[PDB]
Amino acid sequence: METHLYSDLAFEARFADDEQLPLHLVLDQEVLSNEEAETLRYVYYRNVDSAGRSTGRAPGGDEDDAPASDDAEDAVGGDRAFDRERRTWQRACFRVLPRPLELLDYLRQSGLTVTLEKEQRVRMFYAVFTTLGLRCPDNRLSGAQTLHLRLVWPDGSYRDWEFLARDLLREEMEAN
Amino acid sequence: DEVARTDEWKGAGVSRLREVWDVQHRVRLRVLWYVNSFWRSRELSYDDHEVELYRALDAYRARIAVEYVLIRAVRDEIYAVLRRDGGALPQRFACHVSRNMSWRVVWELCRHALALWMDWADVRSCIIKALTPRLSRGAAAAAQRARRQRERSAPKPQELLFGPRNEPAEQTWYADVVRCVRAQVDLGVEVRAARCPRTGLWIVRDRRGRLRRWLSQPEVCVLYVTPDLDFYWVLPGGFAVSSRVTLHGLAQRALRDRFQNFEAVLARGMHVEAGRQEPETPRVSGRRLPF
Amino acid sequence: AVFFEPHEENVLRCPERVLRRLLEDAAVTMRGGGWREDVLMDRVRKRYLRQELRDLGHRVQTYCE
Amino acid sequence: SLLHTFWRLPVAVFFEPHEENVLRCPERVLRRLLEDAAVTMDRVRKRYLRQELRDLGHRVQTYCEDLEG
Amino acid sequence: LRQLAQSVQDTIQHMRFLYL
Amino acid sequence: LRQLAQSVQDTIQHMRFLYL
Amino acid sequence: KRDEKHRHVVNVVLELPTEISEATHPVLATMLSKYTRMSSLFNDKCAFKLDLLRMVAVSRTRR
Amino acid sequence: AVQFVGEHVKVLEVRAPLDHAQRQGLPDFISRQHVLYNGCCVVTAPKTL
Amino acid sequence: DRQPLNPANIEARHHGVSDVPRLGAMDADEPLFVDDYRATDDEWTLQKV
Questions:
Q1: d(Cα A96, Cα A130) in Å, to the nearest integer?
Q2: Where does it localize (chain G) (predicted)?
Q3: Neighbouring chains to D with at least 3 Cβ pairs closer than 8 Å
């Protein structure tokens, strides 16, 4: 619980520089195995725009759409595109609870006055806690955006899950 | 009285527990929605266009299609090299072979192995794990420095004696192993190759010098890739097909966004200098009280 | 039996041009056909058509009473 | 389909399989391999497009009934 | 009134399994 | 009367046809 | 018109013998509408024949 | 009794983890169990079937 | 085949109505047809016996 509100207040904090809005989330054992959760180090997020590239690049286009030229000296055209791919990812917060738990009951052991319309009893085996930050540069949110999870192990491997932003905000955006 | 913002946030509680999925329908994940978050007080709209979704699915098609159009360009290069040599392929791999055996069957088995390998293409394959060390941070500088070091002048005796001294007969390849008869395509494996100095051919081994013995068996074929974009299709009998994997039909940023090699960020229990032996992992587990 | 130690000059023939021609037939019948990436695109399109069909069915149900 | 060996005379072998790979297999096991390898391996989509168009016709005639009901 | 609406509603889910 | 539900049905149905 | 399509369902889809028509079986005249509503699966005659057989089973019960 | 046709047979895979006690060690284990759906157990080869 | 058919979104089957999509998609084993009768735990145990 104690991790989502930090980036909530932090995306409220840095709303002058970047125009970001939070998305707090919890993930079950269906996403990843427990040995993939007990050693996991950090999470990354990316906002890939609808008919575009990302939101970390230049606004209109960049020079890195060239053919790869089948060589080694310009295999990436230099490490500046490597620095660009390091720039387009940002780091989110992270919490791991490696005990089986009831989510409504876990929030009820905290002071969270949960009021559900139905007792949806969700019972998973461990609780990772993170916050994806998807953004909109204009104050109007396009429903064709794409959010990109990134989960990296201390070994270095990763499994990029990703999803569009239409089934995410088809209801709560309309619930405002 | 002055009530803090965290008190109202804690006494707020989540409105409702939503749960969504991904594009591939593989991972569901549960999303909360707090009432006293600042997401409500922003007064934002939602314009879900249809052609924006069309172009978003086009970009998603490109992002999935990176490695698969790479594999189909690989297969085009196989057929192109098999045509341009007229089908008289050379032997590049050290293996004792016979002559009193009908090679009519092994060509049909190699074609069937090619078809079964193309049936089981995957993101865990040869060319992607060969490209990931090339996609690294200092791989371009190491490659051009190896290019400058492989091309040196004649060793003069002046720099031979009193100058500074001079400084790799083993290579770490990647391989895809297709088992044609039992129909078990083994996706991606490490292998270590060398020049067997009795002749001018290659020898493949495991991490313990195991001398990988599939090439004797007529039931299997293998694909070899090296970190210098080399392509070795091997059927039994030691005869090989050698070519270069192409990348002209791929965007640079597609290769960057799909399978970029990662460079580390600092955390707890990690040395500030790099290239050292590390301590134990964090490993916050469900075996211990959190101390 | 008895064998041959390998070399780089021992080669294998194009096998009498009766399987090489069949291999080029395989190349030309797999040039235009299934491309192995749009299969997953068909999978997500079938998932999308099904979820929008249930969306339309439930919407006309809750507005038909 | 016989190959063209560079060395003219065949060379004897006593190597154990750890040392070297050999192709010692006879014809009958390769006939078994051919038997096990040969046998081991749309318009309806556009028809569903046309059926969706027939369903468009169905909903617009029931909407004509809705206007004239 | 509404039974006509349900009899025209129920045939919409009658086409899913033959489609996909 | 019932212009609204069937008119937005036409809109979402032809939006659905833009998938394929 | 509807008559030709009913002959296509009766004679070409179902392959019922020609001593049977829409007047010697009431559930035929009932379910020919639901057979003609389904435009596809006319290659799949076996599912329509089994639907006919289960419908004449459920009609002539004693419940 | 063709009112209740059932369906075709189909084999069916079940992935279920253990209880909250055998999952202490090996929390990745999934009991990949195969069951058979709409079939019957048979001891005699059917001759006309 | 590929994804776990967990909730009641996919399984559905009636009787007497003669759903010819159910009879036509019988080899299409992805939308399976449950008998709409959740087996209770006692008969589940005796079935396993």
A1: 9
A2: Virion; Host nucleus
A3: B, C, E, F, G
Residue to mutate among C42, C50, C53, C58, with most E CBs inside 10 A, is C53
Distance CA I24, CA A100 (A): 44
A93 Rama class: left (phi>0) / alpha (psi -120 to 50) / beta: beta
Chains I and G touch (3+ CB pairs under 8 A): yes
3-state DSSP assignment of residue H8: coil
Stated as kind and residue range, the H or E segment containing A152 is strand A146-152
Closest residue in chain B to residue C3, using alpha carbons only: B98
Instruction: State the method.
Output: cryo-EM
For F9, the token pair is 């049905």
Across the interface, whether the CB atoms of E12 and C57 are under 8 A apart is answered yes
Answer whether I22 sits within 8 Å of E15, measured CB to CB. Answer: no
CA B50/CA B36 separation, integer angstroms: 32
Amino acid at I19: D
What angle, rounded to 10 degrees, do the helices at B126-134 and B139-150 form? 80
Cα–Cα distance for residue pair I12/A59, rounded to 1 Å: 49
Q: Where are the beta strands (DSSP E) in chain B?
A: 18-20, 29-31, 46-47, 170-179, 186-196, 201-205, 220-225, 230-234, 240-244
Q: Rounded to a whole number, what is the distance in Å from the CA of D40 to chain C's nearest CA?
A: 17
The token pair that represents A68 in the structure block: 């790869």
**How far is the CA of A133 from the CAs of A6, A171, B41, B179, in angstroms?**
12, 18, 17, 45
Rounded Cα distance between G35 and G39, Å, is 8
d(CA D31, CA B102): 11
What is the separation, in whole angstroms, between the first and last Cα of chain B? 37
List the single residue in F with minimal CA-CA distance to B57: F19
Are chains B and C touching, using the cut-off of 8 Å on CB pairs and a minimum of 3 such pairs?
A: yes
* DSSP-derived secondary structure letter, B260: P
CB B67 within 8 A of CB B259: yes
F2 contacts D49? CB cut-off 8 A? no
Residue showing tokens 């595109």: A81
- For residue B127, give the nearest of B246, B262, B256 by alpha carbon: B246
